[PDB]
Design a protein around this nucleic acid. Structure first.
Lengths: 144, 134, 57, 184
RNA sequence: GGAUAGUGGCCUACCAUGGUUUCAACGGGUAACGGGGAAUAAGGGUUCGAUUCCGGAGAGGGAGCCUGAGAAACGGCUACCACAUCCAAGGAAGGCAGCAGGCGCGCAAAUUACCCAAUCCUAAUUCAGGGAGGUAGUGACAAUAAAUAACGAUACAGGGCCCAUUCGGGUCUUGUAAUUGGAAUGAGUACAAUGUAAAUACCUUAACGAGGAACAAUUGGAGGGCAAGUCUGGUGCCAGCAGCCGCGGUAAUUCCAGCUCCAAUAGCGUAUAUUAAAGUUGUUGCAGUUAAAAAGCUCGUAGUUGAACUUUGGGCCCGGUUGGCCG
């Protein structure tokens, strides 16, 4: 009998069973409860500007050993505080104290990339200027 | 233009505007283009009308040069042409003069300024002058 | 082990050799033609299998 | 506001982007047909896919169905008119048999090369884009211009081009002036 | 019975005690205007639709109402609320979610430009008005086509092969080049003409406009997925890279660079959302002994489902279809 109702007038039972079982699906439940809107630091936005509160060194997870360079940053639009990796060599020097930075995700949706523990966001633009532009010297940080 | 041999197609006559209208094309090999005057004079002589009586417009030069197509409109009289053509096309043809209406923003400003005044305002001008003197 | 300063160590320590001037490579269809001769008619790249960037052995 | 101006894409990038077999095969087509990008290959393959999809629909349709006859006749007619198909292979299944090289062969590049006006396909493309070729009697400088099965009789040098009997170009004219000045 | 333009608990008066609900009433949330539709799919489907069309609703909130045929009208009035403007301090005057434009907000979105020439609209009306609308500007949101170079001779070095007077020049080489030549052109200027309401562009075309240092194509990548480096220098679990596995602890094919190569190419990457992949939502089409999952067991209402049986077969024609008998 395969456990599910087969009868021709049983569409209601199948529909509510499907509804009751849809909730065990990870992304669907998040979409309906609006957790991305409600709880996620960006409120569903792909990017968000914030002020760097402080610089941070975060030791990498095993088997790797290094100190990834991050920043504790308070978002403009929520006030929520987020750690953000500064994704290139020596770019932690470009990020000073109290700059306005742009933050983007790490690609691993709402998760942590690789060996960096708990850092779910990365800085993209520093004081309105691009990190890789600064890192390849195609632009100069205004320093103001 | 060298070997214009201007051709005219779909030459339907409209007594409503009292004219003959056709799709005109001009072949101008080895020459860039042909102008309004040179088109109108040739069309005028072939249709037995004055240079002004015939109107042509909408000339798009087809790729590679060689020929263009426009729209031709030969009227039954100069008076018919004067009544029926738009003023922009008449001044385009040089027969008429550009109307001297002011810009839209200045024109609209005039409307809204005079909207604030009820009637002639001659009495108001006298009263404002008396108070300003006072 | 351990550093919050000295960020940018190898990036600043690398001895920068500038790019060598060279004839500009063709663009577009010219470049595709260049690839075609490089990888089909100049069969001189096979060592047994058609390598594309062999090392200077 | 205005009614919307419709538009659509003409190509479909492949799934599994890095099959070495497909990359090598498509570069062979690009090299032998003088294409500029893989976009041309994608466009022709998208076009062939569309025609093959329509032909497959109509071929599994029942015989002498009015829809099959009308649609199939139209499909084969434009195919043979563009010349990609051939009149000996008039039946509908031959459309399924078609390959991207067939459309490429009927492109304006290769027809100019096959008519002998060009030194090669790349020389052909330069000649087309520089407004030196002409179909019917009109300059055409789209290399992808499909030639109907009747316009091969009209493809030759443009009357406006120096190779069509026109004014002796620009650099030759400049060099002629320099020669006259140096001899002056 | 009032009221309505008009039906009606729309309202009033008397009366009866009814109406909806586990076939999900009522209540809450909606990061919800509805639809035609959009994206993506073998089939089923999943997600999106503020937004060019249709239909609703609003002019900051809320109400009230004049004129008119049509208004709860707000580019109309009244009051209150909240804002906010000028006063000579008594008064007065406003609603951009119209067009531009400014601030704020944010990741996130343009000119305080020209015009009624179209398409239409309105008026007493062929003539006027129309930030409706069109034109231009901004504009890498998207889609279309498509430049960034072609050709010859020698030098360079072999393969078909005239003869193999080899395999020589190499006849046709095909490629390699700091070899050299002429030839073509557009991008951009530009007389002009068309184009336009007037223009700007497009389309056309005099004059000018390629030889590299030029008129220079980038964006990502080279360990596997996923084709492209066992090449060189630097760092030495540091810096860093890496979607995942992983690389790096003085011989790094993975970091920083050079060279070389690869992919897509006026495009390429990145973040988020979403779809196919996903038979990981399973109606088609999942799984439940051990991987997560059979309630401790039974009763039972709603629900779903539920044994067989009732006119059959046979004769009589007609007329349509595939046709083939028959050319």
């Amino acid at each position: 009998g395969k456990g599910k109702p087969r009868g021709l007038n049983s569409a209601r039972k199948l529909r509510v069973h499907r509804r009751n079982n849809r909730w065990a699906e990870n992304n669907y439940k998040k979409r309906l409860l609006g957790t991305a809107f409600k709880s996620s630091p960006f409120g569903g936005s792909s990017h968000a500007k914030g002020i760097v509160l402080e610089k941070l060194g975060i030791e990498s997870k095993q088997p790797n050993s290094a100190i990834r360079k991050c920043v504790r940053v308070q978002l403009i639009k929520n006030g929520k505080k987020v750690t953000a990796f500064v994704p290139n060599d020596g770019c932690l020097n470009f990020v000073d104290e109290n700059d306005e930075v742009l933050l983007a995700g790490f690609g691993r949706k709402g998760k942590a990339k690789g060996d960096i523990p708990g850092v779910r966001f990365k800085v993209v633009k520093v004081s309105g200027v691009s990190l890789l532009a600064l890192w390849k010297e195609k632009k100069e940080k205004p320093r103001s | 233009s060298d070997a214009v041999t201007i051709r005219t197609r779909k030459v339907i006559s409209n007594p409503l505007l009292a004219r003959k209208q056709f799709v005109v094309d001009v072949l101008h090999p080895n020459r860039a283009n042909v102008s309004k005057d040179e088109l109108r004079e040739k069309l005028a002589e072939v249709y037995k009308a004055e240079k002004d009586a015939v109107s042509v417009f909408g000339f798009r030069t087809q790729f590679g040069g060689g020929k263009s197509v426009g729209f031709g409109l030969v009227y039954n009289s100069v008076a018919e042409a004067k009544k029926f053509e738009p003023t922009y096309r008449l001044v385009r043809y040089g027969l008429a003069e550009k109307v001297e209406k002011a810009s839209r923003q200045q024109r609209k400003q005039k409307k809204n300024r005079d909207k604030k005044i009820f009637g002639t305002g001659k009495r108001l001008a006298k009263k404002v002058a008396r108070r300003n003197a006072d | 082990h351990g550093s919050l300063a000295r960020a940018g160590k190898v990036k600043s320590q690398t001895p920068k050799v500038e790019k060598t001037e060279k004839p500009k490579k063709p663009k577009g269809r010219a470049y595709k033609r260049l690839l075609y001769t490089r990888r089909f008619v100049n069969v001189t790249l096979v060592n047994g299998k058609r390598r594309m960037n062999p090392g200077p052995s | 506001p205005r009614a919307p101006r419709t538009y659509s894409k003409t190509y479909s990038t492949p799934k599994r982007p890095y099959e070495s077999s497909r990359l090598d095969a498509e570069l062979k087509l690009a090299g032998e047909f003088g294409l500029k990008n893989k976009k041309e290959i994608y466009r022709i393959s998208f076009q062939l896919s569309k025609i093959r999809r329509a032909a497959r629909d109509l071929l599994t349709r029942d015989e002498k169905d009015p829809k099959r006859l009308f649609e199939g006749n139209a499909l084969i007619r434009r195919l043979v008119r563009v010349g990609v198909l051939s009149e000996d292979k008039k039946k509908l299944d031959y459309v399924l048999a078609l390959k991207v090289e067939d459309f490429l062969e009927r492109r304006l590049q290769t027809q100019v090369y096959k008519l002998g006006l060009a030194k090669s396909v790349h020389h052909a493309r330069v000649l087309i884009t520089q407004r030196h070729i002409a179909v019917g009697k009109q300059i055409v400088n789209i290399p992808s211009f499909m030639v109907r099965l009747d316009s091969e009789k009209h493809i030759d040098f443009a009357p406006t081009s120096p190779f069509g009997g026109a004014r002796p170009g620009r650099v030759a004219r400049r060099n002629a002036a320099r020669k006259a000045e140096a001899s002056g």
